[PDB]
Design a protein around this ligand. Sequence first.
Ligand SMILES: COc1ccc(C2=NN(C3CCN(c4ncnc5ccsc45)CC3)C(=O)[C@@H]3CC=CC[C@H]23)cc1OCc1ccccc1C(F)(F)F
Ligand SMILES: [Mg+2]
Ligand SMILES: [Zn+2]
Length: 329
Amino acid sequence: GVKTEQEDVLAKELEDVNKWGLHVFRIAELSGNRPLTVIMHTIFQERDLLKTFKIPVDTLITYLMTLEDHYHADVAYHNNIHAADVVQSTHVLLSTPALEAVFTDLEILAAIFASAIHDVDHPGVSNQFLINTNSELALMYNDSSVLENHHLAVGFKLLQEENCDIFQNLTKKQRQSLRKMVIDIVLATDMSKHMNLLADLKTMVETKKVTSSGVLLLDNYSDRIQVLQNMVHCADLSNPTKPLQLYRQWTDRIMEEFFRQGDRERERGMEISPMCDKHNASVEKSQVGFIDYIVHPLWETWADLVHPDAQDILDTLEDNREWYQSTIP
Ligand SMILES: COc1ccc(C2=NN(C3CCN(c4ncnc5ccsc45)CC3)C(=O)[C@@H]3CC=CC[C@H]23)cc1OCc1ccccc1C(F)(F)F
Ligand SMILES: [Mg+2]
Ligand SMILES: [Zn+2]
């Protein structure tokens, strides 16, 4: 009933779970390609979610293993490691001092569950790609948030596999509220929603109320869900905010995925997509664009809402942006 030596080293990595900059690829290697399972397990135990929601531990492991196996290992970015990372980033964001004791256990379970399933069974190409290829997924979801609808359907459907229903002891009220929050969160990970989500976050910062302590006041669902959506969306676009060793790996894998869509976009004759090719499109410019137009406006707006808990993260993101700028000839 003692850990193997591999399991111990993994245990000591997982002492960083509450920390921005977790060694997630290392965890991925130490866990035998189980970052999503071991990180989800670790956060569930730490947040006491098995007791609160009467989740049998064998059902949690079976589901988590089933979930991770429905991420594609042959897709370089949108895989189980990105899922683990977004889970752990949402986890750290939930612990932010400015949100202390704001969210119910169900809101927390929804945020973490949403983060774990949000890219499941991602085929390694984009909505526009799936739409333009006339892919079954684009026809199933009448071309609207094709991937995000799919992730949700698979994430929920896998609860129906043998000993996989992690919510089997929740009441119908709990399950109805959890399912609605998880849908609203994952649908908000579609980048075509980003402009609007950010507008609602800007509006919310101008209106920003607070309790007797420094913690935000969110007295309606519209506001509570908006913060959980923007929190997981922040998690999803958090790569450029990590130490550069991490950030650089995420970039390699996104380019590989995008180049690989490019390669596929040549034989299909579709005409290259966004900065997805060497025969032009510079990686370093692309990262500066991404940071200047998407990642910084969002993270800057988040940082104001939780001022000043997000200062270090915003600093790292400004540094990483200067780094990428200095690499341009
Ligand atoms: C580690 O680095 C990245 C991580 C995730 C993403 C993701 N990007 N997107 C993008 C965001 C908006 N898009 C744009 N298309 C053309 N011109 C522009 C100019 C400014 S954004 C933008 C197209 C889609 C996604 O939808 C992904 C799925 C979910 C969330 C985030 C993911 C992008 C990373 O690197 C940047 C990038 C890489 C490769 C090509 C282009 C870009 C680029 F900078 F341009 F974005
Ligand atoms: Mg996604
Ligand atoms: Zn994602």
